[PDB]
Amino acid sequence: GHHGWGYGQDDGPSHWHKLYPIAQGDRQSPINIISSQAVYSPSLQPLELSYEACMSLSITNNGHSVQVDFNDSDDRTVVTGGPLEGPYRLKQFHFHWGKKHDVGSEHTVDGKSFPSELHLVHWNAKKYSTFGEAASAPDGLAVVGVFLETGDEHPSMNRLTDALYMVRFKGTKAQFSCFNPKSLLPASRHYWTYPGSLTTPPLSESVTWIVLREPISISERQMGKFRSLLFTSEDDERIHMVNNFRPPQPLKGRVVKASFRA
Numbered sequence: 001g002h003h004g005w006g007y008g009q010d011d012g013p014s015h016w017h018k019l020y021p022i023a024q025g026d027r028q029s030p031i032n033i034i035s036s037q038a039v040y041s042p043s044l045q046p047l048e049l050s051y052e053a054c055m056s057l058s059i060t061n062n063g064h065s066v067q068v069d070f071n072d073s074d075d076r077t078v079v080t081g082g083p084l085e086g087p088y089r090l091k092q093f094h095f096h097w098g099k100k101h102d103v104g105s106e107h108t109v110d111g112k113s114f115p116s117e118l119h120l121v122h123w124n125a126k127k128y129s130t131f132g133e134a135a136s137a138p139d140g141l142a143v144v145g146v147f148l149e150t151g152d153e154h155p156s157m158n159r160l161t162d163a164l165y166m167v168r169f170k171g172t173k174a175q176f177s178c179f180n181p182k183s184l185l186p187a188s189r190h191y192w193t194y195p196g197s198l199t200t201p202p203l204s205e206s207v208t209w210i211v212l213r214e215p216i217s218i219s220e221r222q223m224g225k226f227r228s229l230l231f232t233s234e235d236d237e238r239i240h241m242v243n244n245f246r247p248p249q250p251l252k253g254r255v256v257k258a259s260f261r262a
C-alpha cells in the first residue's frame, strides 16, 4: 500500500505498524549486520549482475526517494547466482540517505551507518506474472543493496545528481535513457544475504536481501545534491527529502550468510 506513510514525525517508520501490521513480522528489514556472526557459505554460487546499457526509462521523485525505472518486459537485465534460484529481473533502483553524514543507510554493519544506501529491486518474473504477485511470495523478490561512502567524485553519479534539480519536486519525472546500473556497483562481488522484507510499506516479507560488502564512493557535493530534493510537491511548503530511511529491525534468530571470510 501507499497511503499516509512517510518519514515525518506523524507518519514515519515508528507509526507504520498501525496501517501495516506486517511491520512487526518475523523477517523485517533492514537489519544491523554483525559481520563476525555472518556465516561463510562457500556452497553459494557466484553472484552475477548482468545489466544492459540502455534499459533505463525515467528518473522520478515519488515523494519517498528518487527512482530510476527499467523495462522488465524481458529477461536481459537480471541478477542471478548467490542465494538466488534462477534470474530476477531489475524493475527499478532508488536511494535512502540522511540529513547528516553519519546517518542515511538502512542496513548498518557492526552498528555503523553509511551516508546513503542504493537499492536495486528485482523480481522473479520467471515464475510470477507481475511484480505485485511476486511481492506477495517469500521467494518473489531480490534486492541488491550497495552502500555509499563519501570520497572521490563518482563519474556516472554526476549524470544522476545533475538530473535531480529537474525532479526536485514530488510527483515529477524526466527521461533517463541509457544509464547502466552496473556503473553504480563496486569492483567486489562479495556479499551478505538474509531473508527479509521491503523497507517501505507494504513491507512485504518476500525479499531475499543481497548486501554488497564493499561500498562505492561519491563526493560530499553529490551527496549534497540528494539532500536538495523535496518530499513535497510544487505548490506546497517545502520539506526536504532527507532521513528517508527505516531503522534496523529485530533479527529474530535469522541467519546472515556471507560469501567471504573476514
Ligand SMILES: CC(=O)Nc1nnc(S(N)(=O)=O)s1
Binding pocket: 119, 121, 143, 197, 198, 199, 200, 201, 202, 203
Ligand atoms: C514497488 C516497490 O518496489 N516497493 C518497494 N518497497 N520497498 C522497497 S526497498 N526499499 O526494500 O527496496 S522496493
Ligand SMILES: [Zn+2]
Binding pocket: 094, 095, 096, 119, 199
Ligand atoms: Zn529501498
